[PDB]
Amino acid sequence: SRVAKAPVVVPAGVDVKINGQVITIKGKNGELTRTLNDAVEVKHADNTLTFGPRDGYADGWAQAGTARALLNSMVIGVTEGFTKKLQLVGVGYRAAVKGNVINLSLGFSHPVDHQLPAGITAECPTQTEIVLKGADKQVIGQVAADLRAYRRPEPYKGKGVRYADEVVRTKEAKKK
Amino acid sequence: MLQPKRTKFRKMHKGRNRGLAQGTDVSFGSFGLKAVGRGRLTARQIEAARRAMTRAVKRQGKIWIRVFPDKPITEKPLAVRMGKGKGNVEYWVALIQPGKVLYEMDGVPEELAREAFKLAAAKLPIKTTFVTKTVM
Amino acid sequence: YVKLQVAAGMANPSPPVGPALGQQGVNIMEFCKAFNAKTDSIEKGLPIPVVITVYADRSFTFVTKTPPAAVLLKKAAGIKSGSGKPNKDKVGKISRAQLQEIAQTKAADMTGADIEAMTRSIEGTARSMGLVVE
Amino acid sequence: MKVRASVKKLCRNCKIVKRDGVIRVICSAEPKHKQRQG
Amino acid sequence: MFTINAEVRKEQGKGASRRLRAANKFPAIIYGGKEAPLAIELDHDKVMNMQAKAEFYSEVLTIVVDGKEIKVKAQDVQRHPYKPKLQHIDFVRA
Amino acid sequence: ALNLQDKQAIVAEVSEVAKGALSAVVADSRGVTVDKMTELRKAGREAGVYMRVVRNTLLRRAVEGTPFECLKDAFVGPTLIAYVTEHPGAAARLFKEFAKANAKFEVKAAAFEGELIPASQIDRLATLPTYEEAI
RNA sequence: AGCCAGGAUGUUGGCUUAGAAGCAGCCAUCAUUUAAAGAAAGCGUAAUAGCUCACUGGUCGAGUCGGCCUGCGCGGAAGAU
RNA sequence: GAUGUCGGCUCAUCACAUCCUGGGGCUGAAGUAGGUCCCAAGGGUAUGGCUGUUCGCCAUUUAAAGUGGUACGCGAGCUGG
Ligand SMILES: [Mg+2]
Ligand SMILES: [Mg+2]
Ligand SMILES: [Mg+2]
Ligand SMILES: [Mg+2]
Ligand SMILES: [Mg+2]
Ligand SMILES: [Mg+2]
Ligand SMILES: [Mg+2]
Ligand SMILES: [Mg+2]
Ligand SMILES: [Mg+2]
Ligand SMILES: [Zn+2]
């Protein structure tokens, strides 16, 4: 509603293709496509995208808000781009990229090889740091969650795959 | 625990509990806890609630109990057949009709009386509402 | 960087100042004699507060502050220890002339603009320790 | 997880959420505060 | 100055009064003086918000019965046994 | 919470001290500890300067009654006023040393003679000496 | 609502304790500079530090907050061929 | 004008309020091991001493030695303490 009523500014060099409910947003960083919920009426006009409810649909404003939010991060995606930074904490924990595969040593018997999806790229500036880069905000978010999942930050020493912006609360072990 | 000091008779007919209450106004304090339901309050429930509200106000202010458990309740023990006389009195109840002001309070701020009454209400078998004193 | 309250002519024992400031990285014999050389003008039997400023090279510079408000009210009323339950138990008495004496000394550390502003700030320290204004 | 008929906010960081027809108390400050109505 | 709007009652009794309350209205009476008592009907929400103000029970109120204005004072109130509602009001001619 | 009575009181107090004073200084004070502020409040009361942080909407109201009605465009961002009631100058110099010594903030705009002074030309009320200098 | 900034001084309030410095407890709970800042709502330290809130200035720009009377739903809801 | 009673044997079948194994949240969960709760009924779930015993106590096992319903399952199937 307050989100839906806020227009998304499509910059110069960004192509917007609307075929009914299907929206393709082309830019310098890539091309993303989304199908908007039937309750959303998306209007182009000028250098902006405006979202609003469709008559006869109950949750129209809730839907238009989501649609807006999604198309804004799509525009930011195909331009600026997204960056997720993870950092490995604990003895022996190491990582490296070999093309589209993140090899991870995380205290297991077998090393973990994580295959990356289409659009997400990774590079290791250190043996203990992973930097993800992509256009789709959901996919970069998904991949960063899956990498964290291998060894979620333990609460006794903070060991494991953590987000760079992560506040890992630690606690003392039982007394005696 | 409330109970009559003496009684004309030991045992009482079951009776019925129809009608609306008498004594539906905050008549002594500033705040009251009114019954919205119909039912029997037992002397132990009356005490459980009185204890809960008293702790809550840290034994400051004044509390009134507008109900008295004057009805004797009998019960037949286990492994006893029907008949062979009316059972023995085991506990005492106060019949409650919708509208009865059960407890009154003053000498404490509204916010505290409300909390103290929330705590007492949890010990009672009938639905209650918070009530304030009125000008007529 | 640590804050402490050491005596006018006493600075060296282990229980009050010893491993409290020594754990950071401050010289135990250099500060103890440089503090008592400057606080020599300060009267005997009066705790004087001092703030320590330490750098990366273990070096130190200190600025001496005026005696505390709860400290000067004890010698003005004639008491060694305060009341366990303030405003419930009275332990002494201080006049309006004694209130302005503590305030004129504390003027270097006080936030107040006028004499009446600094005096009311000492009035509050007296009430919270059991001492009554008489 | 605490499963009970009466679910409430236990601190300021507690938040009441309804996930798939089930009232829940999700809390950012204390894991002990995590509740599901049931 | 409290102003109450009222209509004269076209009906009386248990049946008719219960019908009023079901219709978010309530019966009331105006009595006192040489004049005959006047059975009236009041809007529940309007009088309920008024009577919340302490002044309602002390001040002289005006009841507007079909154009005519009646100066009264709240004599007695019959409240609902447990809900924050009004059953009846006795207005005395002031 | 500030009521309207309270806001009308604050406009009155800063309208009275508007007429009386000679030189007024409007500056930013964001990201500065209270230790440094109580230190500029001591060096302000000494120099016969009135120091205050007033709501910019409430300032555009006290300043509408003339002559500071050109200090309007300086009521955007955090605003602190330095009203010199005793001897013109004092603050415009007290602030310049506080700004350079603390590095935080920039000092918005100054006012004297019922005229606007830009952020670059605040050297005019900074080089002015005493009253008390003509003898 | 979010985001920027501050959240000070006397003072480490007094008593107690090896220490209690808003933050084991007990008692008091004022006063100053103030835009505002409890002699302190929680976590943290051996005690300090450090992190945040109550409160207030800025930004933003139009609504926002939660009690009352009520209709219909939700959880509470485990059993044997 | 008759619906054979307790326990054992043999043979089972369902419920889940789960004893083990499986998944999972909190823990006053360092690990190992526990405590508590949620999901789950697929399979699996001692032999003996004493007593008619069911139970229970005891010995030694086991991943575990589940709780209940089935005319307190089962005598035109057996036993008869
Ligand atoms: Mg789910
Ligand atoms: Mg009838
Ligand atoms: Mg037969
Ligand atoms: Mg189950
Ligand atoms: Mg339990
Ligand atoms: Mg089974
Ligand atoms: Mg076992
Ligand atoms: Mg049988
Ligand atoms: Mg046979
Ligand atoms: Zn919580």
Coordinates of C-alpha atoms and ligand atoms in Angstrom, one line a residue, chain D residues 9-15 25-30 33-34, ligand 10:
Chain D
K9 CA 4.5 -12.3 24.0
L10 CA 7.1 -12.8 26.9
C11 CA 9.3 -9.9 26.2
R12 CA 9.4 -6.7 23.9
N13 CA 11.3 -8.7 21.2
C14 CA 8.5 -11.4 21.0
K15 CA 6.3 -11.2 17.9
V25 CA 5.5 -16.6 19.1
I26 CA 8.8 -15.9 17.2
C27 CA 11.4 -14.1 19.3
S28 CA 14.7 -12.4 18.2
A29 CA 16.2 -12.0 21.8
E30 CA 15.4 -15.3 23.6
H33 CA 10.4 -17.7 24.2
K34 CA 9.6 -19.6 20.9
Ligands
ZN10 ZN 10.9 -12.9 23.7

